[PDB]
Amino acid sequence: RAPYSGPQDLAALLEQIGCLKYLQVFEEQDVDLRIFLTLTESDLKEIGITAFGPKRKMTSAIARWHS
C-alpha cells in the first residue's frame, strides 16, 4: 500500500471526521489544511463553527494531526 501520513488537504480531513458540510465555510475564509491545524477553539468560532459537535470533532482532529 502507498505510505500514508495523514490527511493531505482540508477536504480529506473533514471527510475523515464527517464534516464535509463545513468545507465551504473554510474555503470562503481561505483556510487550508496548514492553517486549520493551527486553529484554537476560539478561532473556529471566529471562522463560523459554532455548533458544539463539529467544533469538538475539529479540535480533536487538530490535536490528532498537528504533529
Numbering used by the authors: 2 to 68
The paper states:
Both ANKS6 and ANKS3 have a similar domain structure, with ankyrin repeats at the N-terminus and a SAM domain at the C-terminus. SAM domains consist of approximately 70 amino acids and adopt a globular structure generally containing a core of five α-helices. The protein-protein interactions of SAM domains are typically mediated by two distinct surfaces on the domain, termed the mid-loop (ML) and end-helix (EH) surfaces.
Because the wild-type SAM domain is relatively insoluble, forming heterogeneous polymers, it cannot be crystallized directly. We therefore used a strategy that has proven successful for a number of other SAM domain polymers, where we attempt to crystallize SAM domains with mutations in the polymer interface. ANKS3-SAM L52A crystallized in space group P41 with two molecules in the asymmetric unit and the structure was solved to 1.6 Å resolution. Each SAM domain has the characteristic five α-helical fold and chains in the asymmetric unit are nearly identical (RMSD of 0.29 Å on backbone atoms and 0.3 Å on all atoms). Examination of the crystal packing reveals a triple helix of intertwined SAM polymers. As expected from the mutational studies described above, the ANKS3 SAM domains associate via sequential interactions of ML and EH surfaces.
